[PDB]
Design a protein around this ligand. Structure first.
Ligand code: HEM
Ligand SMILES: CC(C)=CCC/C(C)=C/CC/C(C)=C/CO
Length: 424
């Protein structure tokens, strides 16, 4: 069952000597240990250097400076000329020749970044956006209704039945991907997302083959829309133009590959962590369920602060930096620990309280601001609002019944399984 926890309980005090950000065992510990570790770093070692996680037998790469304070993360995000996103935003890129293939605009600095982001942004036309909005509601409604039809027992895993499929179905709908191709897209996406996680033991050759197959699918989808225009994002991406520059089909494919990761597992984990928090703190569910539209904006923003689905993003210094008196050298890696910034005692009153009315809420779960600020933030907020709306309408007493099975990850605050139950 759910471990009892009172809303507002701080994490345990974790001694500095017990914190090993380069240790896989550390990332396997519960959230209360992790949160207490970052609280210790914020108080005692707010900028500190760490080795990467080393998987024995594979190259590890160089270490990184951990920024744990909201102010430092915000500063780094606002200075992309010093804190570069190229070559990649993870601590150690396992496939650096494919950094742009999987990363699209997220691994680019200006001027390349602004050009690609500007063209992609222009493709989100009013008609495309209106279809996306209808899709969010339709998909969330259908998935919750199917959970009821498929489980007369009133019990299901929220991840497989709802939080997992919703964000990827929305991405498929916006790309104009036929219903008949969903199973293939889901399979390829799952293999890609599953590679950095052990269990099932994900084979690199299979990972490379599926990565090329989904890329080839997307290039062919884009080429089809060059000939046959439709009212989807794929067609608007082929037609968009900034300063005479348009996107090639392989640029569109790389942006699609970014989406099925960045727009997908993040939202999934915001949903699962939101359902978990609403189950642990039933007063907050009651408040939201009593004034759903009125509290939606603050409730969703609190779910994102609480979940921080993206644990960190990595930058690389283009020049020496001295901040908080800590000297970091050009070429060093720097990590922005949003999970920590979203608990910074200097910015949030009562940071350990999950409060669906929280205002202000300067949360940085979509990043600290600036050039790379999540392109889909308002879409993510809509997905979260709409899915909880559909749960409230169709199964208002739905509740998590067990502690989640946690993903072992430094980068994603992941829930692999979340049992829930509901009545009429
Ligand atoms: C709760 C869900 C989500 C979270 C927590 C999240 C978080 C993030 C973060 C932390 C970044 C990097 C920001 C930075 O470096 O300053 C980012 C970038 C991005 N996200 Fe999201 N994201 C979410 C959902 C989405 C969705 C739904 C989409 C679209 C389907 C999306 C598309 C993108 C793109 C395209 C970028 C790269 C933007 C750039 O590099 O200019 N994300 N997101
Ligand atoms: C989670 C967000 C916001 C973006 C994802 C970018 C990402 C997962 C890069 C992974 C780098 C890598 C080793 C890719 C091989 O798939």
């Amino acid at each position: 069952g759910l471990l009892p926890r009172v809303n507002g309980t701080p994490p345990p005090e974790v001694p500095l000597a017990d914190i090993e950000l380069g240790s896989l065992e550390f990332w396997g510990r519960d959230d209360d240990f992790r949160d207490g570790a970052f609280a210790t770093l914020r108080r005692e070692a707010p900028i500190s250097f760490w080795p990467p996680i080393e998987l024995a037998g594979l190259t590890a790469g160089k270490g990184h400076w951990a920024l744990t304070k909201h102010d430092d993360i915000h500063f780094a995000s606002r200075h992309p000329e010093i804190f570069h996103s190229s070559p990649n935003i993870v601590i150690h890129d396992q496939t650096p020749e494919l950094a742009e293939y999987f990363g699209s605009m997220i691994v680019l600095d200006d001027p390349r970044h602004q050009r690609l982001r500007s063209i992609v942004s222009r493709a989100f036309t009013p008609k495309v956006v209106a279809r996306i909005e209808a899709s969010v509601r339709e998909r969330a409604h259908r998935l919750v209704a199917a959970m009821i039809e498929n489980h007369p027992d009133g019990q299901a895993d929220l991840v497989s039945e709802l939080a997992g499929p919703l964000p990827l179905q929305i991405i498929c709908d916006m790309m104009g991907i036929p219903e008949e191709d969903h199973e293939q897209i889901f399979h390829w996406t799952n293999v890609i997302l599953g590679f950095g996680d052990p269990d099932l033991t994900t084979d690199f050759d299979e990972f490379l083959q599926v990565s090329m197959a989904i890329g080839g699918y997307a290039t062919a989808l884009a080429d089809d829309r060059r000939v046959n225009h439709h009212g989807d994002l794929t067609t608007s991406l082929v037609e968009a133009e900034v300063d005479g520059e348009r996107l090639s089909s392989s640029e569109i494919a790389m942006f699609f590959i970014l989406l099925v990761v960045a727009g997908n597992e993040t939202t999934r984990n915001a949903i699962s962590h939101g359902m978990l928090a609403l189950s642990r703190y039933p007063d907050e569910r009651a408040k939201w369920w009593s004034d759903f539209d009125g509290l939606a904006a603050t409730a969703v923003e609190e779910i994102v602060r609480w979940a921080s689905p993206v644990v960190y993003m990595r930058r690389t210094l283009s020049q020496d930096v001295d901040l908080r008196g800590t000297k970091m050298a050009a070429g060093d890696k720097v990590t922005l620990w949003y999970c920590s910034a979203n608990r910074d005692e200097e910015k949030f009153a009562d940071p350990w309280t999950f409060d669906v009315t929280r205002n202000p809420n300067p949360q940085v779960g979509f990043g600290g601001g600036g050039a790379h600020f999540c392109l889909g933030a308002n879409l993510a907020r809509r997905e979260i609002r709409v899915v909880f709306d559909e749960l409230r309408r169709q199964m208002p007493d739905v509740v998590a019944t067990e502690e989640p099975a946690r993903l072992l990850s430094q980068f994603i605050h992941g829930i692999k399984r979340l049992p829930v139950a509901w009545s009429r």
